[PDB]
């Protein structure tokens, strides 16, 4: 008694785990202020004034 049961890995679960890791690595490398997120995850240079 008292084990942990985990299901079979789908390839869809496995590729989602890879793309989630890419997202968290982009957040570490790029920064996590809302302007840094926009500039790292998208091509966009937001003005500072409009983001307070």
């Amino acid at each position: 008694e008292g084990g942990e049961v985990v299901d079979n890995l789908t390839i869809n679960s496995l590729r989602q785990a890879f793309q989630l890791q890419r997202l968290l690595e982009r957040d570490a490398r790029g920064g996590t202020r809302y302007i840094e997120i926009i500039r790292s995850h998208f091509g966009v240079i937001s003005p500072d004034a409009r983001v307070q």
């Binding site: 490398r29 790029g30 920064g31 996590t32 202020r33 302007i35 840094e36 500039r39 790292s40």
Partner: peptide
């Protein structure tokens, strides 16, 4: 002056 690693600090 470009996008630095670890987010911006001047």
């Amino acid at each position: 002056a470009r996008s630095m690693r670890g987010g911006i600090r001047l």
